[PDB]
Write a protein that binds this ligand. Sequence first.
Ligand SMILES: [Fe+3]
Ligand SMILES: [Fe+3]
Length: 300
Amino acid sequence: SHMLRLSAPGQLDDDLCLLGDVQVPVFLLRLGEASWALVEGGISRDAELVWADLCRWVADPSQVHYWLITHKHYDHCGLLPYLCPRLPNVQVLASERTCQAWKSESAVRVVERLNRQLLRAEQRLPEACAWDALPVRAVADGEWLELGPRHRLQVIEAHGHSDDHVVFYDVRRRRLFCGDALGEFDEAEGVWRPLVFDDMEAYLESLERLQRLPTLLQLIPGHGGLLRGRLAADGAESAYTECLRLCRRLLWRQSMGESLDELSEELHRAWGGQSVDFLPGELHLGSMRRMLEILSRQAL
Ligand SMILES: [Fe+3]
Ligand SMILES: [Fe+3]
């Protein structure tokens, strides 16, 4: 494995564990002797796995006080209706737009449909809270979340991947939970693959701002584990570069008269393997096409 990427379940740092699968992780923060937080909301089918793992570390689940959520995509909030009823004291901390999504019928539909496609035959989901009944507190750009005596995290708006996306920055630890704002980390090659699914200008602007943070030591995206060393320090910059690279490739191909499909198909070939276990059906190819449409409009 690579020393700069921690990619195994369990303890990551003195205060930090990875619950569930490294591909769609839930992070556990130990806030004090009787207090914990979760970060990232996973996929619904992982409810019993994540619960099992949580209970190995947390003897009394009424001590889980906060659950921080980066964005509204199905793979970042799918666990909430299934595990919140088991976490009686939890407060879900999410952006205003992310909270709005959970009050939208159309929105909830897509999330439930995409999550149901990842169930296996033999599983029953736990009994769920209604999405509009989740124990939420909306949080604002720039807000400091005083989670515990040695855990103070700043909310930072990071739109572009989605129109609601935020990141959470722990400056004590130079630790950034960046969701999908940097893209998908390529485990084979050590580079970012852009995930521009809403707005390219916003995505790049977000990265520009994140580059201005004090140097990072730990960078924790939505998928793939914890990145450290140079990967953390250079991540926002590298992510920006890889986005420009993709834009340039797209223009090269379109200038030869190719349809957006030729590159979508190539990108689905080159990149779709890593996420096959949590992107159902045709979603990766369609996501590629979406992203290329966005880039094409905002830069052809
Ligand atoms: Fe996403
Ligand atoms: Fe994601």
